[PDB]
Design a protein around this ligand. Structure first.
Ligand SMILES: NS(=O)(=O)OCCCCCCCCCCOS(N)(=O)=O
Ligand SMILES: [Cl-]
Ligand SMILES: [Zn+2]
Length: 258
């Protein structure tokens, strides 16, 4: 009985094996655009993905991960609410069975068709492992996806999904440039949160971009063709692999824009 997104192992069940699920700084959260406050103290955000090196893509039975070589200081995120340097280790998506849902974070309760998460760990901690043991060990850049025009930079990921249909499958995936997944504006909302999947560790400084990127219906449709199950097992389409908004509690969401 592993955690998942179904009726018996979904988000409402996670708290049992991971009690932190009802903790003080859980993610995602609804972003009330009116209560969020512009924060002058925020330094401009710096996203340097020019030397990013993807290695492979994997279907972990929950979503698919495009992994990067974080052994050197290549793809890094800095500035903004962040202190020091954060290194890109991987990115993945959360999407729905329908365009009307899929994103984890919401803006004034609005749910986007999907959400992109670029995961980075604080280099002051050496590696990813030691970083997820720190309140500021991680920084995740979240980008909303809506259905409309196709996103050219995403097609390479799309055409490769066929090779990793089922849980456990992986395929080499080099030279993928994540800069092709970024919207025009770096305007964002930021707050202290956690991983949205178990172990739901509260080590994350979330940075959610205001401007969503648009992908085509055909692109998101292929995401939906993926499987939760492993090869040779009953087909369970990989859809609605998103955790709903959690209590904001003792927190304030700051805006990088006025
Ligand atoms: N293997 S290790 O010791 O180096 O580290 C274990 C960490 C376990 C947790 C891994 C979590 C990885 C991110 C999952 C998605 O999070 S989200 N959706 O972006 O909030
Ligand atoms: Cl199901
Ligand atoms: Zn995620």
């Amino acid at each position: 009985h592993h955690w998942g997104y179904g009726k018996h192992n979904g988000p409402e069940h996670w708290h049992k094996d991971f009690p932190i699920a009802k903790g003080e700084r859980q993610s995602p959260v609804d972003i009330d655009t009116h209560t969020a406050k512009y924060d002058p103290s925020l330094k401009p955000l710096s996203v340097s993905y020019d030397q990013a090196t993807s290695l492979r893509i994997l279907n972990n039975g929950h979503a698919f991960n495009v992994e990067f070589d974080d052994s050197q200081d290549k793809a890094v995120l800095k500035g903004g609410p962040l202190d020091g340097t954060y290194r890109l280790i991987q990115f993945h998506f959360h999407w729905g069975s329908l365009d009307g849902q899929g994103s984890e974070h919401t803006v004034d309760k609005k749910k986007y068709a999907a959400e992109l998460h670029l995961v980075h760990w604080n280099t002051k901690y050496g590696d990813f492992g030691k970083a997820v043991q720190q309140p500021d060990g991680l920084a995740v850049l979240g980008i909303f996806l809506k259905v409309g025009s196709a996103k050219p930079g995403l097609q390479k990921v799309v055409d490769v999904l066929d090779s990793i249909k089922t849980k456990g499958k992986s395929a080499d995936f080099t030279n993928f440039d994540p800069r092709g997944l970024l919207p025009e504006s770096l305007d964002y909302w930021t707050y202290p949160g956690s991983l949205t999947t178990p172990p739901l560790l509260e080590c994350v400084t979330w940075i959610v971009l205001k401007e969503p990127i648009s992908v085509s219906s055909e692109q998101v449709l292929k995401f939906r063709k993926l499987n939760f199950n492993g090869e040779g097992e009953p087909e369970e389409l990989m859809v609605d692999n998103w955790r709903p908004a959690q209590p904001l509690k003792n927190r304030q969401i700051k805006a990088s824009f006025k």
